[PDB]
Scaffold this active site. Structure first.
Site, PDB file in Angstrom:
ATOM      1  CG  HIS A  84      -1.983  -1.094   1.056  1.00 20.32           C
ATOM      2  ND1 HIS A  84      -1.859  -2.258   1.761  1.00 20.32           N
ATOM      3  CD2 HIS A  84      -3.134  -1.192   0.371  1.00 20.32           C
ATOM      4  CE1 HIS A  84      -2.887  -3.031   1.505  1.00 20.32           C
ATOM      5  NE2 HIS A  84      -3.679  -2.405   0.670  1.00 20.32           N
ATOM      6  CG  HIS A  88      -2.186   0.056  -4.189  1.00 22.06           C
ATOM      7  ND1 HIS A  88      -2.793  -0.967  -4.884  1.00 22.06           N
ATOM      8  CD2 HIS A  88      -3.126   0.563  -3.369  1.00 22.06           C
ATOM      9  CE1 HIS A  88      -4.043  -1.092  -4.472  1.00 22.06           C
ATOM     10  NE2 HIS A  88      -4.264  -0.176  -3.549  1.00 22.06           N
ATOM     11  CG  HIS A 124      -7.870   3.854  -3.078  1.00 18.53           C
ATOM     12  ND1 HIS A 124      -6.861   3.967  -4.011  1.00 18.53           N
ATOM     13  CD2 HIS A 124      -7.807   2.589  -2.606  1.00 18.53           C
ATOM     14  CE1 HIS A 124      -6.238   2.814  -4.125  1.00 18.53           C
ATOM     15  NE2 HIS A 124      -6.793   1.961  -3.285  1.00 18.53           N
ATOM     16  CG  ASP A 125      -5.333   1.938  -0.201  1.00 18.34           C
ATOM     17  OD1 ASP A 125      -6.180   1.673   0.650  1.00 18.34           O
ATOM     18  OD2 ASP A 125      -5.166   1.214  -1.205  1.00 18.34           O
ATOM     19  CG  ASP A 237      -8.391  -1.470  -3.682  1.00 17.75           C
ATOM     20  OD1 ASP A 237      -7.258  -1.047  -3.888  1.00 17.75           O
ATOM     21  OD2 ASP A 237      -8.883  -1.498  -2.535  1.00 17.75           O
TER      22      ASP A 237
HETATM   23  C1  LIG Z   1      -2.574 -10.028  -5.364  1.00 15.42           C
HETATM   24  O1  LIG Z   1      -3.210 -10.705  -4.280  1.00 15.42           O
HETATM   25  C2  LIG Z   1      -4.107 -10.000  -3.521  1.00 15.42           C
HETATM   26  C3  LIG Z   1      -4.735  -8.818  -3.941  1.00 15.42           C
HETATM   27  C4  LIG Z   1      -5.556  -8.128  -3.062  1.00 15.42           C
HETATM   28  C5  LIG Z   1      -5.771  -8.606  -1.770  1.00 15.42           C
HETATM   29  C6  LIG Z   1      -6.724  -7.957  -0.858  1.00 15.42           C
HETATM   30  N1  LIG Z   1      -7.366  -8.786  -0.107  1.00 15.42           N
HETATM   31  N2  LIG Z   1      -8.053  -8.324   0.995  1.00 15.42           N
HETATM   32  C7  LIG Z   1      -8.840  -9.457   1.545  1.00 15.42           C
HETATM   33  C8  LIG Z   1      -9.252  -9.173   2.990  1.00 15.42           C
HETATM   34  C9  LIG Z   1     -10.028  -9.763   0.637  1.00 15.42           C
HETATM   35  C10 LIG Z   1      -7.988  -6.995   1.361  1.00 15.42           C
HETATM   36  O2  LIG Z   1      -8.849  -6.534   2.076  1.00 15.42           O
HETATM   37  C11 LIG Z   1      -6.967  -6.070   0.712  1.00 15.42           C
HETATM   38  C12 LIG Z   1      -7.169  -4.552   0.845  1.00 15.42           C
HETATM   39  C13 LIG Z   1      -8.315  -4.064   0.000  1.00 15.42           C
HETATM   40  C14 LIG Z   1      -8.591  -4.621  -1.160  1.00 15.42           C
HETATM   41  C15 LIG Z   1      -8.136  -6.001  -1.540  1.00 15.42           C
HETATM   42  C16 LIG Z   1      -6.877  -6.455  -0.774  1.00 15.42           C
HETATM   43  C17 LIG Z   1      -5.143  -9.777  -1.366  1.00 15.42           C
HETATM   44  C18 LIG Z   1      -4.334 -10.500  -2.232  1.00 15.42           C
HETATM   45  C19 LIG Z   1      -3.844 -11.815  -1.741  1.00 15.42           C
HETATM   46  C20 LIG Z   1      -2.827 -11.888  -0.792  1.00 15.42           C
HETATM   47  C21 LIG Z   1      -2.456 -13.093  -0.238  1.00 15.42           C
HETATM   48  C22 LIG Z   1      -3.082 -14.271  -0.631  1.00 15.42           C
HETATM   49  C23 LIG Z   1      -2.585 -15.560  -0.085  1.00 15.42           C
HETATM   50  O3  LIG Z   1      -3.340 -16.515   0.064  1.00 15.42           O
HETATM   51  N3  LIG Z   1      -1.285 -15.605   0.202  1.00 15.42           N
HETATM   52  C24 LIG Z   1      -0.771 -16.450   1.248  1.00 15.42           C
HETATM   53  C25 LIG Z   1       0.583 -16.944   0.832  1.00 15.42           C
HETATM   54  N4  LIG Z   1       0.673 -17.523  -0.358  1.00 15.42           N
HETATM   55  O4  LIG Z   1       1.552 -16.743   1.565  1.00 15.42           O
HETATM   56  C26 LIG Z   1      -4.105 -14.209  -1.573  1.00 15.42           C
HETATM   57  C27 LIG Z   1      -4.476 -12.996  -2.120  1.00 15.42           C
HETATM   58 MG   LIG Z   2      -7.694   0.361   1.065  1.00 10.63          MG
HETATM   59 ZN   LIG Z   3      -6.170  -0.043  -2.358  1.00  9.58          ZN
END
Ligand SMILES: COc1ccc(C2=NN(C(C)C)C(=O)[C@@H]3CC=CC[C@H]23)cc1-c1ccc(C(=O)NCC(N)=O)cc1
Ligand SMILES: [Mg+2]
Ligand SMILES: [Zn+2]
Length: 333
Positions: A84, A88, A124-125, A237
């Site tokens: 963030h 981003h 937004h962040d 996002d």
């Molecule tokens: C590019 O990947 C993403 C993109 C976005 C997010 C988000 N995910 N979240 C979740 C709570 C739904 C957020 O709130 C973030 C803040 C606001 C918007 C979306 C963001 C999370 C990931 C993401 C991160 C980690 C994992 C995961 O399972 N990793 C664990 C590992 N492999 O170590 C999956 C998706």
């Molecule tokens: Mg945010």
């Molecule tokens: Zn964002």
């Protein structure tokens, strides 16, 4: 709130972005960052060009200088965190440009609304610390306490809106100063509504609201517009998985690291660490990205495209292609 100097403006204006098409769906911000030893100025320049190239600031009485001041004020309030950060929000700005203009979502919104969305991307962040809402509440940090006391669980989103309003209250950086009456009000309201809708706790209901409105030929028009704006900022996002695989992967790495640092601080402080945030647990991006695709991003993009946003079909195509690529990483491990 110190004003922006001519010296700071020049450092952005000198960047020329040779070889980059900021309007393209395959634009690569990581390669843009590497291209100079001044990645912050380049990112600023990208946002500047995106905004000027839209033609929109000019139409609403936002001079070139005020636009650039605004960009630099936003930039001063992002931190050095792995995900963030300023890159981003520039990414989200750029991505939104593509959804509007390559995906023809501009047709669903007024010009003011398009302008507001591009601006809102950059606020937004604001001032994110690499810790999510949950961290502040579980740890009973001062901001968490204040959010509980005041009844608003969206700890960070309210904070971002506060700092946006702060930047815009100086005419030197008020990209909305050319507006008045209902327009100025709609600009602020819609900016704020959009940022509040990026809290992922509200994801399901924002999606359901948008879809129900889009299927309703008697939906109130103003409401449909607002929801369309909200859905588009949300879309930007969670757009990392709609990008070319190497770009998508680099984003996943950045976010993963930031989640892991949150889990480190939770451990240290003895609070509950979720599996996703825990270094000691995982050893695999592939499964994470596929899970995020299956449970969050693919259903979201497919549904909004089918309901209404036909021009954004490519997003659904790239998710599918990226998912197939992650499955190959598994199949060959
Ligand atoms: C590019 O990947 C993403 C993109 C976005 C997010 C988000 N995910 N979240 C979740 C709570 C739904 C957020 O709130 C973030 C803040 C606001 C918007 C979306 C963001 C999370 C990931 C993401 C991160 C980690 C994992 C995961 O399972 N990793 C664990 C590992 N492999 O170590 C999956 C998706
Ligand atoms: Mg945010
Ligand atoms: Zn964002």
């Amino acid at each position: 709130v110190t004003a922006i100097t001519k010296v700071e403006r020049e450092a952005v204006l000198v960047c020329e972005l040779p070889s980059f098409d900021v309007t393209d769906v395959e634009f690569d911000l990581f390669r843009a960052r590497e291209s100079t030893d001044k990645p912050l100025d380049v990112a600023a320049a990208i946002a500047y060009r995106l905004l000027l190239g839209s033609g929109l600031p000019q139409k609403f009485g936002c001079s070139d200088e005020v636009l650039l001041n605004f960009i630099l004020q936003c930039r001063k309030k992002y931190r050095n965190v792995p995900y963030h950060n300023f890159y981003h929000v520039v990414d989200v700005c750029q991505t939104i440009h593509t959804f509007l203009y390559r995906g023809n979502v501009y047709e669903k919104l007024t010009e003011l609304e398009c302008f507001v969305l591009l601006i809102t991307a950059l606020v937004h962040d604001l001032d994110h610390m690499g810790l999510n809402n949950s961290f502040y509440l579980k740890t009973e940090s001062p901001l968490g306490i204040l959010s509980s006391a005041s009844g608003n669980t969206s700890v960070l989103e309210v904070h971002h809106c506060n700092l946006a309003v702060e930047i815009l209250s100086d005419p030197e950086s008020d990209v909305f100063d050319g507006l008045e009456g209902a327009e100025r009000t709609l600009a602020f309201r819609s900016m704020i509504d959009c940022v509040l809708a990026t809290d992922m706790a509200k994801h399901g209901s924002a999606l359901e609201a948008f879809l129900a409105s889009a299927a309703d030929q008697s939906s109130d028009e103003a409401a449909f517009h607002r929801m369309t704006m909200e859905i588009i900022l949300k879309a930007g996002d969670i757009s990392n998985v709609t990008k070319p695989f190497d770009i998508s992967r680099q984003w996943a790495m950045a976010v993963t690291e930031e989640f892991y640092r949150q889990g480190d601080m939770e451990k240290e402080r003895g609070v509950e660490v979720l599996p996703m945030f825990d270094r000691s647990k995982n050893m695999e991006l592939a499964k994470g990205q596929i899970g995020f695709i299956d449970f969050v991003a693919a259903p979201f993009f497919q549904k909004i495209v089918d309901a209404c946003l036909q021009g954004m079909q490519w997003t659904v195509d790239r998710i599918k292609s990226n998912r197939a690529q992650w499955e190959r990483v598994l199949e060959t491990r």
